[PDB]
Structure formats: C-alpha cells, structure tokens
Design an enzyme around this catalytic site. Structure first.
Site, PDB file in Angstrom:
ATOM      1  N   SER A  45     -14.792 -31.164  47.484  1.00  0.00           N
ATOM      2  CA  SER A  45     -13.615 -31.598  46.741  1.00  0.00           C
ATOM      3  C   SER A  45     -12.525 -32.427  47.397  1.00  0.00           C
ATOM      4  O   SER A  45     -12.213 -33.517  46.913  1.00  0.00           O
ATOM      5  CB  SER A  45     -13.001 -30.403  46.022  1.00  0.00           C
ATOM      6  OG  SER A  45     -13.971 -29.781  45.194  1.00  0.00           O
ATOM      7  N   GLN A  79     -14.311 -25.125  48.168  1.00  0.00           N
ATOM      8  CA  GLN A  79     -15.109 -26.283  47.745  1.00  0.00           C
ATOM      9  C   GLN A  79     -15.043 -27.461  48.705  1.00  0.00           C
ATOM     10  O   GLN A  79     -14.308 -28.423  48.482  1.00  0.00           O
ATOM     11  CB  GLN A  79     -14.705 -26.714  46.331  1.00  0.00           C
ATOM     12  CG  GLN A  79     -14.828 -25.588  45.310  1.00  0.00           C
ATOM     13  CD  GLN A  79     -14.589 -26.034  43.875  1.00  0.00           C
ATOM     14  OE1 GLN A  79     -14.756 -25.250  42.944  1.00  0.00           O
ATOM     15  NE2 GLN A  79     -14.202 -27.293  43.689  1.00  0.00           N
ATOM     16  N   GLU A 128     -16.692 -18.455  41.963  1.00  0.00           N
ATOM     17  CA  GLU A 128     -16.040 -19.067  40.802  1.00  0.00           C
ATOM     18  C   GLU A 128     -17.087 -19.440  39.765  1.00  0.00           C
ATOM     19  O   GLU A 128     -18.137 -19.976  40.098  1.00  0.00           O
ATOM     20  CB  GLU A 128     -15.265 -20.342  41.162  1.00  0.00           C
ATOM     21  CG  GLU A 128     -13.925 -20.120  41.842  1.00  0.00           C
ATOM     22  CD  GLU A 128     -13.164 -21.410  42.057  1.00  0.00           C
ATOM     23  OE1 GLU A 128     -13.274 -22.313  41.206  1.00  0.00           O
ATOM     24  OE2 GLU A 128     -12.449 -21.526  43.071  1.00  0.00           O
ATOM     25  N   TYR A 182     -20.138 -24.384  37.977  1.00  0.00           N
ATOM     26  CA  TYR A 182     -19.594 -24.657  36.656  1.00  0.00           C
ATOM     27  C   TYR A 182     -20.554 -25.390  35.743  1.00  0.00           C
ATOM     28  O   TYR A 182     -20.747 -24.987  34.595  1.00  0.00           O
ATOM     29  CB  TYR A 182     -18.299 -25.458  36.759  1.00  0.00           C
ATOM     30  CG  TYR A 182     -17.146 -24.660  37.298  1.00  0.00           C
ATOM     31  CD1 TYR A 182     -16.385 -23.858  36.454  1.00  0.00           C
ATOM     32  CD2 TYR A 182     -16.808 -24.710  38.650  1.00  0.00           C
ATOM     33  CE1 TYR A 182     -15.316 -23.130  36.931  1.00  0.00           C
ATOM     34  CE2 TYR A 182     -15.734 -23.982  39.144  1.00  0.00           C
ATOM     35  CZ  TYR A 182     -14.993 -23.193  38.272  1.00  0.00           C
ATOM     36  OH  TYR A 182     -13.924 -22.467  38.735  1.00  0.00           O
TER      37      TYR A 182
END
Ligand SMILES: *[C@@H]1O[C@H](CO)[C@@H](O[C@@H]2O[C@H](CO)[C@@H](O[C@@H]3O[C@H](CO[C@H]4O[C@H](CO)[C@@H](O)[C@H](O)[C@@H]4O)[C@@H](O)[C@H](O[C@H]4O[C@H](CO)[C@@H](O)[C@H](O)[C@@H]4O)[C@@H]3O[C@@H]3OC[C@@H](O)[C@H](O)[C@H]3O)[C@H](O)[C@H]2NC(C)=O)[C@H](O[C@@H]2O[C@@H](C)[C@@H](O)[C@@H](O)[C@@H]2O)[C@H]1NC(C)=O
Ligand SMILES: *[C@@H]1O[C@H](CO)[C@@H](O[C@@H]2O[C@H](CO)[C@@H](O[C@@H]3O[C@H](CO)[C@@H](O)[C@H](O)[C@@H]3O[C@@H]3OC[C@@H](O)[C@H](O)[C@H]3O)[C@H](O)[C@H]2NC(C)=O)[C@H](O[C@@H]2O[C@@H](C)[C@@H](O)[C@@H](O)[C@@H]2O)[C@H]1NC(C)=O
Ligand SMILES: *[C@@H]1O[C@H](CO)[C@@H](O[C@@H]2O[C@H](CO)[C@@H](O)[C@H](O)[C@H]2NC(C)=O)[C@H](O)[C@H]1NC(C)=O
Ligand SMILES: *[C@@H]1O[C@H](CO)[C@@H](O[C@@H]2O[C@H](CO)[C@@H](O)[C@H](O)[C@H]2NC(C)=O)[C@H](O)[C@H]1NC(C)=O
Ligand SMILES: O=S(=O)(O)O/N=C(/Cc1ccccc1)S[C@@H]1C[C@H](CO)[C@@H](O)[C@H](O)[C@H]1O
Ligand SMILES: CC(=O)N[C@@H]1[C@@H](O)[C@H](O)[C@@H](CO)O[C@H]1O
Ligand SMILES: *[C@@H]1O[C@H](CO)[C@@H](O)[C@H](O)[C@H]1NC(C)=O
Ligand SMILES: *[C@@H]1O[C@H](CO)[C@@H](O)[C@H](O)[C@H]1NC(C)=O
Ligand SMILES: *[C@@H]1O[C@H](CO)[C@@H](O)[C@H](O)[C@H]1NC(C)=O
Ligand SMILES: *[C@@H]1O[C@H](CO)[C@@H](O)[C@H](O)[C@H]1NC(C)=O
Ligand SMILES: *[C@@H]1O[C@H](CO)[C@@H](O)[C@H](O)[C@H]1NC(C)=O
Ligand SMILES: [Zn+2]
Length: 499
Positions: free
Chosen positions: A188, A185, A407, A328
């Site tokens: 992040s 990521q 993910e 997500y």
C-alpha cells in the site's frame, strides 16, 4: 464435503449451517481497527495522515473528512472493549499510533508517558475480557517530523527510528501482547503513497498528479518498499533476539488479492495473471521467504529495483513467525503496456497488466463490493472463492506459513440513514461467504490459518473516503460518537461466534 456459494443469494448467514464450531476449538475470531481511523488527534503528535488530509483535503475523502475526531476511541476505548465483549470475540487487532507514544518521532527525543498509559489501559482491559490483542506497530501513521526530516520510508534513516519505536513497544507492552504486526499492508504505502499519491505522504511524478509536492512514481515505490522490508526485518530480528522471553510472535501484514485471467484461454492474459501474483504478492513474499525479489521483477524493473546485500537478504529472509493476511477482493488480469520512458510512468505499470472485475466474456466476478458514484465502470466486485485461492497459494508457494486473517470486510454507503446502515445484510453475506471458503480451505488444503479478524469493529474514518463509506460491524452516530451499537452484521457475528 464442504460446499460454499460464490453468487447471490447466500445462505451462509444461517448459524445452524455455518458457525465457529465449524472451525478448530482454538480458532480466534474478532475484529480489527487502526489508530488514525479511530482515536482522534487528542493526546498525540501529528503524523503524515494528519498532514496529508489537511494539505490535500480533496484526497482525504469526497467529504474532506479526516481523522481529527472520528469515533473518538481515545475517550471511548472502553466502548470498543464493550463491543468485543458483546461479540464474545477472542481477538482484537488495533494499531499503536507512533505519534501518540513518541510525538517527536525519534525515541531519544522523549516519550509520551500518557500515550503509553493509553495503550496499557486498552491492553489490560482486553485481556481482562479474555480478548487476545493483535497489535500493529505501524498502520501508516508516520510522525510528520520524520517525513519532514528525511521523507520517512523514502530514506534508510527510517530503519533505526522504526526499530527504536518498536523496541519501546515491546518493552512497554510485550509482557501482555503476544501477537505483533509490523507494517500494515506492505504493498500500500509504496504504491498509493509514493506512486499514485492517493495516500499519505502524497508523493508522485509531476505528470501523474500536479498536486504532489515532490516525487517519482517510477522509482520511489521500489525504494519505499525496500526500506519497509528492511525496517520490518530489523524489528523482527530485534523482537526475536531481545524479546524472546515474552513468548510472542511477530509478522508483517500483507494485502492479498487473488488474480484470474481476464480471458482464461488467452496465453497473454494468463501470463499477465501470473505476473500480477509476482508483482503484487511476490514483491514482498519473495524477500520474506527467500531474501530476493521475484525474477520477473528483477528483469522488468532493472536498475530501479534495489538490491539486498548478503546481510540484508539473510535478515529479511524468514523474518516472520506468522503472516497477517488482509483479503478483500480478486481481479481479472489482462496484458497492458509498460511505458517506462513516459513521464507518467508508475511502478504499478511494471506488472504489465490491466485489472478489471469483469472478464472478456462480460462476466462480473461476483457481488457488488463498492459502488463508485463518479463512474459506474469503476465499481468493485468481490469473489468469496478468492480467500480459498489466496490461502492455498500461500501454503503451497510460500512454505506453509502460520496465517491469521487480519482484515476482511465490506463497506456500505455513508448516505444511508441510521436504520438502513443498521440493516447491513450485504455485510453478513460478504463475511459469511468468505468464512465459508476459509473453513473450506483449512479443511481441504490444510492451510495453517488460526484466526480471523473482520475489518472495522465500528464505523470510522476510511482512508481516501472520509466518512462516505461505513465498514463497521457496529454503528457510530457522527453527531454523538459515544455509542457503538451492533448492526445486523455484528448481531450475526455474535451468533456465529457463540451459536
Ligand atoms: C532465491 O534466492 C536465490 C539466491 O540465494 C536465487 O538464486 C540466485 O538467482 C540469481 C538470479 O536472480 C542468480 O544470479 C545470477 O547469476 C548469474 C551467474 O553468476 C555466476 O556466474 C557468473 C559467470 O560469469 C559469475 O560472474 C558470477 O559471479 C556467478 O558466479 C549472473 O550472470 C546473473 O547476472 C545477470 O543477471 C542479473 C539479473 O538476475 C543482473 O542483475 C546482472 O546485472 C546480470 O545481468 C545473476 O547474478 C546476479 O547479478 C546481480 C547481482 O546483484 C547479484 O549479486 C548476482 O548474483 C544466482 O546465481 C542464484 N543463486 C543461487 C544460490 O542459485 C533464487 O532465484 C531463482 O533460482 C535461480 C537459480 C534463477 O533460476 C532465478 O531466476 C530464480 O528466481 C531465489 N528463488 C526465488 C524463488 O526467487
Ligand atoms: C479469448 O482469447 C482467445 C484467444 O486469443 C480468443 O480467440 C481468438 O480470437 C481471435 C479473434 O479476436 C481469433 O483470430 C481471428 O481469427 C479469424 C478467423 O481466422 C480471423 O479472420 C481474424 O483476422 C483473427 O485472426 C487473427 O488476426 C490477428 C493475427 O495476429 C492472428 O495471428 C490471427 O489468428 C483467434 O483465432 C481466436 N483463437 C482461438 C484459438 O479461438 C477469444 O475470442 C473469442 O473467441 C473467438 C473464437 C472469436 O469468436 C472471438 O470473436 C471471440 O471474442 C477470447 N474470448 C473473448 C470472450 O474475448
Ligand atoms: C524518476 O527517476 C528516474 C531515475 O533517476 C528517472 O529516469 C532516468 O531518466 C534519465 C533522463 O531521461 C535517464 O538518463 C536515466 O537513464 C533514467 N534512469 C533509469 C535507469 O530509469 C526518471 O526520469 C524520473 N522520473 C521523473 C518524472 O522524475
Ligand atoms: C468469464 O468467466 C465466466 C465465469 O467463470 C466463464 O464461464 C465459464 O466457463 C467455463 C469453461 O468454459 C464453463 O464450463 C462454465 O459453465 C462457465 N460458467 C458460466 C457462469 O458461464 C468464462 O469462460 C470466462 N470468459 C473468459 C474468456 O475467460
Ligand atoms: O491493495 S491496496 O494497496 O489498494 O490496498 N487494498 C486495500 C483493500 C481495499 C481497497 C479498496 C476498497 C476496499 C478495500 S486498502 C483498504 C482501504 C480501506 C478504505 O479505507 C480500509 O478500510 C482497509 O482497511 C484497507 O485495507
Ligand atoms: C478538480 C478538483 O476539484 N480537484 C483539485 C485538483 O485538481 C487540484 O490539483 C488539487 C490541489 O491540491 O485540489 C483539488 O481540489
Ligand atoms: C454449527 O454448525 C454446524 C455445521 O458446521 C452444525 O452441525 C451445528 O449444529 C451448528 N451449531 C449450532 C449450535 O447451531
Ligand atoms: C462465549 O464463548 C464461550 C466459549 O465458546 C462460551 O463458553 C460462552 O458461553 C460464551 N458466552 C456468551 C454469553 O456467548
Ligand atoms: C538488544 O538490546 C541490547 C541492549 O540495548 C542491544 O545492545 C542490542 O544491540 C539489542 N539487539 C538487537 C539490536 O537486536
Ligand atoms: C499518461 O499516463 C496516463 C495514465 O496512465 C495515460 O492515460 C496517458 O495516455 C499517458 N500519456 C502519455 C504520455 O501517453
Ligand atoms: C450522546 O450519547 C450518549 C450515549 O447514548 C447519551 O448518554 C448522551 O445523552 C448523548 N448526548 C447528546 C448528544 O444528547
Ligand atoms: Zn484538523
């Protein structure tokens, strides 16, 4: 014609309607994990997550939990393989702890042969069970020595040290590992680690958070992001020039989110939504596909945005064989001021957008994703269609890339007892609703997605949350972390994979 549900109740948990056969025969299905979250400190050097969680216990999680022992995958790696075997998984994403194989950070200082052996055993065991490894070189756990020597990714010295580390990994594991992920990521660490200081190393401007030991939230995220791109690119170049004989593929991991206008009839909200796509995704995808940052970032960030030299631009452009896309949730975007002169200014403010899960008319985007006990208005909600929108966007905006969903998952409260935690129907709903849309986008938009790895093979230490939330498809008793028992979600996934 495929129809997918966006709101509760979901019926995609029925394997007669949705299963692996819905996807192409070679489609990979599995789960994911990360080194800091599952291994434990035994047998490895210290990294910035050890440093961060120990220096700032309140930031490690509400319970002050950390990755000291966690699920102890160092000792129980075989149990992880057993879970994968039980699921009949064809893929497994895990990360190599830089601190485990080169405790001293710089390769010239020596390597930890026992650490190298640890991964050799894991990789050998996965392959023996017909599981394809997807290995993340850097899942945020930077050796503490490098952060202390030159502040890690804040300094260009990280490029050569990361390159030497990656070289060791390709040399040692490349004959068996054919899918490599460079940095987890990209968005992040620059933002959470150097902007808000919610994550390691915990740097930020003095007025953003007095606890930060040093930093500048307005400039550092851009410097770190720039170095991440250069480090990533140097490693991809190394892989493709010196390890092409291994016949593998390498790519970065992007955290993706979709964005919708807080008010779909308001030009300002619509513009904020498009800016978010550029500031969140374009920040990295622009350099990766064109060797330059998005124009809106160049214009807004100005002097604070580093420039790529012609050589660097050429190196970064096209520096991937595939993209590891983590997904997500989705957020609504509305305009927000960008006070660049304020002492509390952060790089995140540059997008000029405020993000919410509720739109102007009071509509919650989807089912509950994460309940925030500290504040009800801070709850996160999910949006299954978001994965369809993200994939469609990547194919059409970013040159039809080969994609692996690296993910995708949801948490359940850590307060729940064993029985409650095992009956994770909310996780089945989340996973199936996203898989429905993923199948839908592959068929309708012809997006080149070839794999899906659900987040957390089992319960582990969760960055910023300690053990207050569980993300695993397999349950782990913190009083005896030996066993990895499939939850209802794990059992469903097993049926989904082999209907
Ligand atoms: C994909 O990469 C492409 C490059 O490989 C991108 O195209 C480039 O886009 C640049 C803008 O971002 C553009 O650069 C600008 O060029 C202006 C004109 O320069 C020429 O003419 C001048 C005449 O006086 C001369 O002096 C120059 O030597 C050139 O001959 C120039 O005025 C601009 O400078 C101002 O604006 C920049 C901000 O963008 C400021 O940083 C700068 O201080 C000044 O205020 C600018 O030049 C750049 O300035 C910064 C410096 O570090 C750079 O080296 C310098 O180039 C450039 O010409 C093109 N190149 C090509 C090959 O077309 C492409 O961008 C998209 O498409 C372009 C055409 C434009 O529409 C962009 O807005 C788009 O984003 C990238 N595509 C994507 C998807 O991002
Ligand atoms: C999603 O965004 C749209 C577009 O921005 C919202 O519609 C706009 O809502 C404004 C009110 O917040 C309307 O302006 C008002 O118009 C009345 C009637 O003439 C006037 O008395 C008010 O003073 C105000 O006028 C503006 O005042 C500020 C000036 O800078 C500006 O130039 C004036 O126009 C505006 O007309 C309206 N736009 C359109 C084309 O409908 C929308 O707001 C929702 O719908 C509107 C129609 C109204 O019922 C709102 O109460 C309602 O919230 C917004 N949707 C939501 C859910 O927030
Ligand atoms: C973060 O670093 C930036 C850049 O060094 C600082 O911004 C500079 O602030 C000085 C003093 O006001 C100005 O003269 C410069 O023009 C600014 N640079 C630019 C172009 O932004 C900023 O103050 C630092 N933030 C903190 C809290 O230390
Ligand atoms: C907030 O989101 C809701 C749900 O997506 C939007 O409501 C839909 O709006 C469309 C277009 O007018 C209608 O055709 C649908 O019937 C509505 N669906 C529902 C469930 O009401 C609403 O428009 C959004 N609000 C704003 C201001 O963007
Ligand atoms: O876009 S960010 O930089 O915030 O990173 N996005 C993440 C997505 C996300 C945010 C919030 C809750 C849940 C997921 S960061 C998120 C943190 C999770 C908790 O440790 C972890 O389990 C997951 O692997 C990681 O991707
Ligand atoms: C209010 C609270 O409990 N949080 C404090 C925070 O204010 C302080 O800056 C930090 C120092 O490291 O320690 C935390 O525990
Ligand atoms: C898998 O799902 C498909 C629908 O996509 C269905 O036709 C098929 O029967 C299912 N397979 C099994 C064994 O249930
Ligand atoms: C695992 O999947 C393979 C390939 O679909 C299948 O042939 C095999 O029967 C499955 N094994 C079990 C026990 O589910
Ligand atoms: C490939 O390896 C050789 C031998 O160590 C080295 O000289 C060369 O620079 C490497 N190529 C790179 C850095 O991509
Ligand atoms: C400082 O930043 C915080 C967080 O964005 C904000 O709420 C506050 O209003 C800012 N204070 C100033 C200097 O306006
Ligand atoms: C811990 O769990 C293992 C596996 O279930 C079991 O064999 C062992 O006896 C347990 N030890 C304890 C805490 O009694
Ligand atoms: Zn400790």
């Amino acid at each position: 014609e495929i129809t997918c549900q966006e709101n509760l109740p979901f019926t995609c948990g029925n394997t007669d309607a949705l299963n692996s056969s819905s996807f192409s025969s070679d489609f990979i299905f599995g789960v994911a994990s990360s080194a800091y979250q599952i291994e434990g400190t035994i047998g490895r050097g210290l990294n910035i997550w050890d440093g961060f969680t120990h220096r700032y216990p309140n930031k490690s999680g509400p319970d002050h939990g950390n990755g000291d022992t966690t699920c102890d995958s160092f000792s129980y790696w075989q149990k992880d393989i057993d879970v994968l075997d039980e699921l009949n998984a064809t893929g497994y994403r895990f990360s190599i702890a830089w601190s485990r194989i080169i405790p001293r950070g710089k390769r010239s200082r020596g390597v930890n042969e026992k650490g190298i052996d640890y991964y050799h055993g894991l990789i050998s065991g996965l392959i023996k069970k017909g599981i394809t490894p997807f290995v993340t070189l850097f899942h945020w756990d930077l050796p503490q020595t490098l952060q202390d020597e030159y502040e890690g990714f804040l300094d260009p010295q990280i490029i050569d040290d990361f390159k030497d580390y990656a070289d060791l990994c390709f040399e040692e594991f490349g004959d068996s590992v054919k899918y490599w992920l460079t940095i987890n990521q990209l968005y992040s660490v620059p933002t959470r680690g150097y902007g808000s200081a919610l994550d390691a190393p915990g740097r930020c401007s003095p007025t953003v958070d007095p606890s930060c030991y040093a930093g500048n939230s307005s400039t550092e995220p851009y410097i770190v992001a720039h170095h991440q791109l250069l480090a990533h690119a140097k490693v991809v170049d190394l892989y493709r020039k010196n390890y092409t004989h291994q016949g593998g593929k390498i790519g970065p991991t992007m955290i993706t989110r979709w964005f919708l206008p807080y008010n779909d009839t308001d030009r300002h909200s619509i513009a904020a939504t498009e800016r978010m796509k550029e500031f969140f995704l374009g920040w990295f995808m622009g350099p990766l596909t064109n060797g330059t940052y998005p124009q809106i970032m160049i214009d807004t960030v100005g002097e604070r945005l580093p420039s790529f030299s012609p050589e660097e631009s050429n190196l970064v452009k096209g520096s991937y064989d595939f993209l590891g896309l983590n997904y997500y949730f989705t957020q609504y975007a509305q305009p927000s001021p960008n006070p660049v002169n304020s002492t509390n200014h952060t790089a995140m403010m540059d997008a000029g957008a405020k993000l919410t899960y509720i739109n102007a008319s009071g509509h919650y985007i989807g089912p509950l994703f994460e309940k925030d006990k500290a504040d009800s208005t801070d709850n996160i909600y999910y949006y299954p269609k978001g994965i369809y929108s993200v994939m469609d966007y990547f194919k059409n905006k970013y040159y039809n890339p080969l994609i692996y969903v690296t993910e995708n998952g949801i948490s359940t409260p850590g307060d729940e007892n064993r029985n409650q935690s095992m009956l994770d129907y909310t996780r089945i709903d989340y996973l199936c609703s996203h898989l429905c849309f993923l199948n839908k986008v592959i068929k309708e938009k012809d997006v080149n997605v070839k794999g899906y790895l659900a987040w957390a093979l089992g319960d582990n230490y969760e960055f910023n949350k300690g053990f207050t939330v569980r993300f695993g498809l397999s349950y782990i008793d913190w009083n005896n972390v030996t066993d990895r028992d499939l939850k209802k979600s794990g059992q469903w996934y097993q049926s989904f994979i082999s209907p």
